């Protein structure tokens, strides 16, 4: 239950590292789906079963389908960027990578030194998440519906063809 | 028997190819509507009609889209040789430009003639040797020079004496 | 090296692999049954030999990874979605607490087969046709889950064996008739079955995504298609028709009889019910089936909370 | 004054007019050379489609799309506003057998099978007007 | 840490591994053997699927605990479902979901 967590975390890290340093959009989305599967494996290794279930049902099964759908619709076949590839020349990526490494080392220094009994991995089932969702989190559910309705309206208003 | 340019599995492969044949029926002309799958999935091409000069390229391209192993059956005198249309706009035979494995005379042949051609093709497939893999062994196709059908059936054809007279149905 | 935990885990491994081989062989047998009704095992073996030894050709202007990955998805998605179905007491592959949620993950991954095949088939018409097909499958996967959620509400949990045990007295086809018909429609839509076989037939600027797939990848698509309807029928049995529960026959016999009956019913409505239009399919889905699932879930919740003393 | 006087039976790159009396009826030698040219122009036809070599107009408005469609096999070029047909020209001549030229090269008796193979579903219906016209030429009244 | 749960874990692992290995090995056998020689309504329907799938996941969480939430949870989910149906009716009526205008 720990070996699965470490191997899935390593797979997720390597997959998003390949995502941010790739040029083909479909390959980037495929490696992104691979990392989402890995992070769902991370969730299942921790006992958050419902989180992994919604990770593959929705994140790697609805949102990334929309990203792939848009990629095929706009038909990116080397529109002046696949022939340039600025993110491989060092003057574009060394600076932001240095800044990100500094932020990572600051956050990691914050993480260490914090008391840790370990993660038990006890399965928090979907019925407990459902009880909490419609119990002490009622307005969160109703206004998450309101938020998704707002997103529906704005995405229709922008993206319609006419 | 002679052939033209470790053993039991070859017979197994031949049996599998022989019993599973997926046709691509080329319409072309009236042999098609007598006798009645993408070309990528089909392994047998049945040319049934006149090879016109305007759609010889269509036949050539749809033959080139198919994948090895591929066999060709030519039904009808038009696809055999040009038939009765020795004329400017007709290619005199589909074997001018694609290799044909079985030929059927007739204008049109019966559907049972196409069944007989399928049996002939099945025997031809069963008695040939092809490479098992593209990395091991000879990468050559060994077609067998089979006994001709008109010399095989010569004795019973010559032995015919009397037929029914044409004044009855 | 003799101990009965090792013996037990080897028996469960044997049960899982036996289930897997029976599923793949029943899918191949259904492929031949549909080919024949519209030695037989010798003809299937000869077909498999032809697909093995024909050359697997990849287009030069096509991505190799996506083209190779689409039939693997089309097979493995519902072939792994079968793993939650209990075919007999003690003969279930995995007793997951997510269950039909795991089935929903596999359906959501199954849409990627159509999308990937359409993109890797370097053709505008094939891309448009597969994009219409993926739009239809999304439009029916939008309510597949809720059509199952009615039964989850009645059983009270996501586990498969719990649903089967709640189907001890009355099978949920009788209370959840609308959930049953919506699940049947969405399952027949997800696996690309008739009526919704080829949505590109309504327009000549679109072509099928099965084209340019030749030989063994085409065979992967075919066997995965029939395996997908194997597991759709088995899930319909275990969610609406008692699973393995019956009065006289042994439980596996009852499950097999129900699954075979739904198999022939799917063959029959391939053979009988004709073709609707594409906009008719979209309108029917988005304007009938999703509100039907919502109203059925509300009525199910009201009935459940009414019958709670 | 004809709007588009192009070839309808022969391909556009055809030399000579086959029904003239100095044009030979019989088939010339086959060439893989010309065959691969005709194949390569059939492969590049969609790329180099010029919609006035067909009588079309307003070619790419720019919402209009030109397609080719595949009772016999023939092509028809379609001009579309979305899914509505604005104009279409059917490309025929893919089934041209030179039957009238064969009429000039068979005897009156031995041309009868060729009359059968025009409108192949007809058979004797296609046989009938030919023998009726030959019998008009021959001064024959049949019983 | 019972023998039944570890037996089921190993059985599920063997099922997944043998299934993916069977598909991969059969593709490998196919490749190795044998000789050689757009419209924006699609975005609209995918977007609607995404949004309605997230509201579906909310109902997924609700349905497994209908008994424990009581009538108050029924009222909350009825408000949720009514908002969802109002959005669906809005999309249908203003022509977002009409495929042939
Ligand atoms: C092997 C080296 C790498 C080889 C290439 C990559 C292959 C995939 C590697 C990752 C997935 C398999 C990892 C190994 C899992 C083996 C089973 C295991 O460890 O189970 C432990 C645990 C069981 O559950 P629990 O009840 O919590 O355990 C208590 C123990 N009594 O289990 C759990 O709690 C959950 C287990 C993890 C979640 C399920 C599996 C997720 C799979 C994600 C795949 C992502 C995509 C990978 C693509 C690779 C190729 C690019
Ligand atoms: C080319 C390869 C691409 C990648 C292919 C897949 C990679 C992984 C394959 C190897 C998997 C090894 C085994 C993994 C563990 C199996 C057992 C398991 O999941 O146990 C954990 C848990 C048990 O739950 P339960 O027993 O009910 O409760 C006990 C209390 N803790 O059960 C769970 O948590 C169940 C939920 C996890 C189920 C994961 C299923 C696989 C997901 C990936 C599918 C990939 C589909 C193909 C590729 C798609 C496109 C990339
Ligand atoms: C289409 C049917 C698919 C079924 C897949 C799983 C098959 C499992 C077979 C298990 C056989 C034993 C079941 C328990 C004993 C009861 C029956 C005994 C006689 C067979
Ligand atoms: C335990 C039995 C209770 C029976 C009576 C139930 C009905 C009365 C209480 C209803 C409370 C509903 C609260 C809903 C809040 C919705 C907020 C929406 C914000 C947009
Ligand atoms: S051989 Fe005879 S029947 Fe066949 S296409 Fe030619 S004219 Fe028609």
Domain boundaries of chain E, sorted by first residue = 3-94
Residue C63 to residue C68: CA distance in whole angstroms: 9
Residue that has been written with the tokens 């977002």 in this structure: E96
Angle CA C189–C98–A121, to nearest 5:
150
Residue that has been written with the tokens 């019993």 in this structure: B19
Experimental method: cryo-EM
Q: Which of C83, C300, C147, C81 is nearest to E60 (CA)?
A: C147
Note whether E2 contacts C: Cβ–Cβ < 8 A: no
DSSP at B105: -
Residue D67 to residue D46: CA distance in whole angstroms: 8
Protein fold of B3-159: Rossmann fold (3.40.50)
Residue that has been written with the tokens 């959930």 in this structure: C179
The string over B8-26, giving b where at least 16 C-beta atoms fall within 10 Å of a residue's C-beta and e elsewhere, is: eeeeebbbbbbbbbebbbb
The string over C278-289, giving b where at least 16 C-beta atoms fall within 10 Å of a residue's C-beta and e elsewhere, is: beebbbebbbeb
Cβ of E35 and B139 within 8 Å? yes
What is the CATH code of the structural domain delimited by E3-94?
1.20.58.1610
Residue C233 to residue C14: CA distance in whole angstroms: 23
Residue that has been written with the tokens 């037990």 in this structure: C8
Looking at the DSSP assignment, which residues form a beta bridge with residue B23?
B44
Coil, helix or strand for B142?
strand
Coil, helix or strand for B129?
strand
The backbone torsions φ and ψ at residue D67, rounded to the nearest 5 degrees and listed phi first, read -125, 170
Q: Which pair of tokens denotes residue B165?
A: 């007279």
Note whether D67 contacts C: Cβ–Cβ < 8 A: yes
Residue C271 to residue B104: CA distance in whole angstroms: 35
Residue E25 to residue E45: CA distance in whole angstroms: 37
Q: Which pair of tokens denotes residue C50?
A: 């032809």
Q: Which of A133, A125, E71 is nearest to C304 (CA)?
A: E71
Residue C287 to residue C284: CA distance in whole angstroms: 5
| H-type alpha helices, E1-101 | 3-32, 41-63, 66-93
The backbone torsions φ and ψ at residue C231, rounded to the nearest 5 degrees and listed phi first, read -75, -25
Q: Which pair of tokens denotes residue E38?
A: 């757009």
Residue D40 to residue D30: CA distance in whole angstroms: 17
Residue that has been written with the tokens 């009409």 in this structure: E98
Q: Which residues contact B153 (CB under 8 A, 6 or more apart)?
A: none
Do C and B count as touching (3 or more CB pairs closer than 8 A)? yes
Sheet holding D84-91, edge to edge: D64-69, D75-81, D84-91
Question: In this structure, are residues C71 and C224 in contact, taking their beta carbons and an 8 Å threshold?
Answer: yes
Q: Which residues contact C33 (CB under 8 A, 6 or more apart)?
A: C267
Length of chain D: 143
Q: Are strands B71-75 and B102-104 parallel, antiparallel or unpaired?
A: parallel
State the number of CA atoms in the 13 A half-sphere of B162 facing the CB.
2
**Ordered DSSP codes for D98-132:** -HHHHHTTS-TTTTHHHHHHSSTTTTHHHHHHHHH
Q: Which of B128, E92, A34 is nearest to C287 (CA)?
A: E92
Q: Which among C9, C12, C152 has CB closest to E64? A: C152
What value does the CA radius of gyration of chain C take, rounded to a whole number of Å?
A: 20
Separation in Å, CA of A83 to nearest CA in chain C? 18
- The pick from A135, A136, A142 for probing ligand 4's pocket by mutation, whose C-beta has the most ligand atoms within 8 angstroms, reads A142
Alpha carbon distances (Å) from A56 to A32, A37, D83, D110, E63 = 12, 7, 38, 75, 19
Residue that has been written with the tokens 């607490």 in this structure: C97
Separation in Å, CA of C220 to nearest CA in chain B? 13
Instruction: List residues near ligand 1 (CB under 6 A).
Output: A 1, 3-4, 7-8, 11, 34, 37-38, 41, 44-45, 121; E 1, 9, 13
- The pick from C22, C30, C83, C229 for probing ligand 3's pocket by mutation, whose C-beta has the most ligand atoms within 8 angstroms, reads C22
The backbone torsions φ and ψ at residue A50, rounded to the nearest 5 degrees and listed phi first, read -65, -35
Residue C43 to residue C26: CA distance in whole angstroms: 15
Cβ of C214 and B67 within 8 Å? yes
Residue A73 to residue C38: CA distance in whole angstroms: 37
Question: In this structure, are residues C251 and C245 in contact, taking their beta carbons and an 8 Å threshold?
Answer: yes
Enclosing domain of residue A148: 1-159
Separation in Å, CA of B28 to nearest CA in chain D? 7
Alpha carbon distances (Å) from E18 to B169, C18, C189 = 66, 11, 28
Q: Which pair of tokens denotes residue C218?
A: 């085409």
Residue A95 to residue A103: CA distance in whole angstroms: 12
End-to-end CA distance of chain A: 53
Looking at the DSSP assignment, which residues form a beta bridge with residue B104?
B75
H or E element that contains A73:
helix A64-74
H or E element that contains D90:
strand D84-91
Question: In this structure, are residues B107 and B78 in contact, taking their beta carbons and an 8 Å threshold?
Answer: yes
Question: In this structure, are residues E28 and B132 in contact, taking their beta carbons and an 8 Å threshold?
Answer: no
- The pick from E79, E83, E84 for probing ligand 4's pocket by mutation, whose C-beta has the most ligand atoms within 8 angstroms, reads E79
Neighbours of C200 (CB within 10 A): 20
Coil, helix or strand for A22?
coil
State the number of CA atoms in the 13 A half-sphere of B127 facing the CB.
14
Closest ligand 4 atom to Cα of E75: 12
Cis bond before residue B69 (omega within 30° of 0): yes
Note whether C64 contacts B: Cβ–Cβ < 8 A: no
Question: In this structure, are residues A149 and E90 in contact, taking their beta carbons and an 8 Å threshold?
Answer: no
Cβ of C55 and B68 within 8 Å? yes
Q: Which among E19, E46, E66 has CB closest to C135? A: E46
> Long-range contacts for C273-276 (Cβ within 8 Å, ≥24 apart)?
C273/C194, C273/C195, C274/C195, C275/C194, C275/C195, C275/C197, C275/C201, C276/C195
Separation in Å, CA of B47 to nearest CA in chain D? 13
Alpha carbon distances (Å) from D134 to D97, D118, D129 = 22, 17, 9
Question: In this structure, are residues E49 and C139 in contact, taking their beta carbons and an 8 Å threshold?
Answer: yes
Q: What is the CATH number of the domain that holds A137?
A: 1.20.120.1200
Ligand 4 and A149: CB distance under 6 A: no
Residue E79 to residue B150: CA distance in whole angstroms: 84
Q: Which among C101, C109, C119 has CB closest to A26? A: C119
Q: Which of B87, C127, A113, A66 is nearest to D117 (CA)?
A: B87
Question: In this structure, are residues A12 and A6 in contact, taking their beta carbons and an 8 Å threshold?
Answer: no
Question: In this structure, are residues E66 and C155 in contact, taking their beta carbons and an 8 Å threshold?
Answer: no
Cα A47 to its chain centre, rounded Å, is 19
Neighbours of C152 (CB within 10 A): 29
Cβ of E12 and C217 within 8 Å? no
Length of chain E: 101
State the number of CA atoms in the 13 A half-sphere of B90 facing the CB.
26
Q: Which chains touch A (3 or more CB pairs under 8 A)?
A: C, E
Residue E33 to residue C56: CA distance in whole angstroms: 9
Coil, helix or strand for E90?
helix
Looking at the DSSP assignment, which residues form a beta bridge with residue B144?
B3
Nearest CA to ligand 5 atom 6: B78
Cβ of C205 and D78 within 8 Å? no
What value does the CA radius of gyration of chain D take, rounded to a whole number of Å?
A: 20
> Long-range contacts for A96-105 (Cβ within 8 Å, ≥24 apart)?
none
Alpha carbon distances (Å) from D93 to A155, B83, E3 = 51, 19, 77
Question: In this structure, are residues C37 and C271 in contact, taking their beta carbons and an 8 Å threshold?
Answer: yes
If one counts the domains in chain A, the total is 1
State the number of CA atoms in the 13 A half-sphere of C223 facing the CB.
26
Q: Which pair of tokens denotes residue C108?
A: 């959501």
**Ordered DSSP codes for chain C:** ---HHHHHHHHHHHHHHHHHHHHHHHHHHHHHHHHHH--HHHHHHHHHHHHHHS-----TTS-HHHHHHHHHHHHHHHHHHGGG--SSTT--S---SSTHHHHHHHHHHHHHHHHHHHHHS--HHHHHHHHHHHHHHHHHHHHHHHHHHHHHHHHSSS-HHHHHHHTSSS-TTTTTHHHHHHHHHHHHHHTT-TTSS-GGGG-TT---SSTT--THHHHHHHHHHHHHHHHHHHHHHHHHS-TT--SSS-HHHHHHHHHHHHHHHHHHHHHSS-PPPHHHHHHHIIIIIHHHHHHHHHHHHHHHHHT--
Q: Which among B29, B55, B86 has CB closest to D27? A: B86
Residue B101 to residue B121: CA distance in whole angstroms: 7
H or E element that contains D21:
none
Q: Which residues contact E34 (CB under 8 A, 6 or more apart)?
A: B68, B132, B133, B134, C52, C53, C54, C55, C56, C215
Question: In this structure, are residues C255 and C152 in contact, taking their beta carbons and an 8 Å threshold?
Answer: no
Q: Which residues contact C185 (CB under 8 A, 6 or more apart)?
A: C140, C289
Residue that has been written with the tokens 């329907």 in this structure: E45
């Amino acid at each position: 239950m720990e070996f699965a967590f470490y191997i899935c975390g390593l797979i997720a890290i390597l997959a998003t590292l390949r995502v941010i340093t790739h040029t083909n959009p479909v390959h980037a989305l495929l490696y992104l789906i691979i990392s989402l599967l890995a992070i769902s494996g991370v969730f299942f290794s921790l006992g958050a079963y419902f989180a992994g279930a919604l990770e593959i049902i929705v994140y790697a099964g609805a949102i990334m389908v929309l990203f792939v759908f848009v990629v095929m619709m706009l038909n990116l076949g080397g529109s002046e960027i696949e022939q340039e590839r600025q993110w491989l020349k060092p003057q574009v990526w060394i600076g932001p990578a240095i800044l990100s490494a500094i932020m990572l080392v600051v956050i990691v220094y914050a993480i260490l030194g914090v008391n840790d009994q370990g993660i038990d991995g006890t399965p928090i089932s979907a019925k407990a998440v459902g009880i909490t969702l419609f119990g002490p989190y009622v307005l969160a559910v109703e206004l998450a519906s309101m938020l998704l309705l707002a997103g529906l309206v704005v995405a229709f208003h922008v993206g319609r063809e006419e | 028997m002679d052939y033209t340019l470790m053993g039991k599995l070859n017979d197994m492969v031949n049996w599998g190819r022989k019993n599973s044949i997926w046709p691509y029926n080329f319409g072309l002309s009236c042999c098609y509507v007598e006798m009645v799958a993408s070309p990528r999935q089909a392994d047998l091409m049945v040319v049934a009609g006149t090879c016109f000069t305007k759609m010889a390229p269509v036949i050539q391209r749809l033959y080139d889209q198919m994948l090895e192993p591929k066999w060709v059956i030519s039904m009808g005198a038009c696809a055999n040789s040009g038939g009765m249309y020795d004329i400017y706009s007709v290619v005199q035979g589909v074997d001018k430009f694609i290799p044909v494995d079985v030929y059927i005379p007739g204008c049109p042949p019966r559907p049972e003639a196409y069944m007989q051609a399928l049996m002939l093709l099945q025997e031809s497939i069963g008695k040939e040797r092809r490479p098992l893999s593209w990395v091991v062994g000879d990468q050559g196709v060994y077609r067998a020079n089979m006994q001709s059908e008109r010399e095989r059936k010569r004795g019973e054809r010559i032995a015919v004496t009397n037929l029914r007279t044409p004044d009855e149905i | 090296w003799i101990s009965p935990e090792l013996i037990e885990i080897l028996l469960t491994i044997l049960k899982a692999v036996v289930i897997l081989l029976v599923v793949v062989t029943c899918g191949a047998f259904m492929s031949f049954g549909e080919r024949r009704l519209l030695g037989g095992s010798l003809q299937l073996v000869a077909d498999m030999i032809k697909m093995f030894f024909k050359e697997d050709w990849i287009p030069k202007f096509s991505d190799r990874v996506i083209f190779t990955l689409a039939p693997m998805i089309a097979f493995t998605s519902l072939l792994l979605a079968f793993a939650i179905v209990p075919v007999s007491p003690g003969w279930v592959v995995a007793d997951l607490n997510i269950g039909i949620l795991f089935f929903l993950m596999m359906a959501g991954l199954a849409v990627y087969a159509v999308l990937f095949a359409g993109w890797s088939s370097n053709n505008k018409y094939s891309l448009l046709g597969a994009m219409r097909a993926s739009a239809q499958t999304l439009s029916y996967e939008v309510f597949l889950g809720l059509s199952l959620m009615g039964v989850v509400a009645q059983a009270g949990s996501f586990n498969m064996t719990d649903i089967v045990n709640s189907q001890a007295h009355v099978w949920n086809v009788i209370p959840q008739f609308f959930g049953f018909i919506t699940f049947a429609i969405a399952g027949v839509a997800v696996c690309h079955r008739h009526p919704f076989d080829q949505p590109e037939a309504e327009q000549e600027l679109a072509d099928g995504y099965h084209i340019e797939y030749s030989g063994m990848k085409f065979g992967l698509f075919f066997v995965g298609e029939y395996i997908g309807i194997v597991t759709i029928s088995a899930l319909m049995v275990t969610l609406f028709f008692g699973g393995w529960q019956g009065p006289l026959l042994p439980p596996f016999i009852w499950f097999a009889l129900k699954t075979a009956f739904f198999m022939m019913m799917f063959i029959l409505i391939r053979a009988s019910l004709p073709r609707p239009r594409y906009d008719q399919v979209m309108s029917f889905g988005w304007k009938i089936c999703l509100p039907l699932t919502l109203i059925n879930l509300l009525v199910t919740a009201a009935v459940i909370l009414w019958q709670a003393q | 004054g004809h709007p588009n006087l192009r070839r309808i039976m022969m391909p556009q790159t055809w030399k000579g007019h086959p029904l003239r009396k100095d044009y030979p009826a019989r088939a010339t030698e086959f060439s893989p050379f010309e065959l691969t040219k005709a194949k390569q122009d059939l492969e590049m036809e969609a790329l180099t489609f010029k919609p006035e070599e067909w009588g079309m107009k307003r070619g790419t408005n720019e919402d209009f799309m030109f397609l080719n469609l595949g009772h016999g096999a023939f092509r028809i070029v379609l001009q579309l506003d979305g899914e509505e047909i604005v104009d279409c020209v059917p490309d025929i001549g893919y089934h041209h057998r030179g039957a009238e030229k064969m009429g000039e090269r068979q005897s009156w008796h031995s041309y009868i099978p060729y009359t059968d193979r025009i409108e192949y579903l007809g058979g004797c219906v296609n046989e009938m007007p030919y023998v009726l016209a030959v019998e008009k030429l021959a001064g024959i009244t049949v019983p | 840490t019972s023998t039944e749960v570890i037996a089921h874990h190993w059985a599920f692992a063997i099922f997944l591994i043998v299934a993916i290995g069977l598909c991969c090995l059969m593709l490998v056998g196919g490749w190795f053997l044998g000789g050689r020689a757009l419209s924006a309504k699609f975005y609209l329907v995918a977007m609607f699927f995404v949004i309605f799938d997230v509201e579906a996941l909310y109902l997924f969480a609700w349905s497994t605990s209908i008994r424990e939430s009581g009538w108050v949870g029924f009222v909350e989910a009825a408000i949720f479902i009514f908002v969802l149906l109002a959005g669906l009716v809005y999309l249908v009526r203003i022509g977002a979901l009409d495929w042939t205008p």
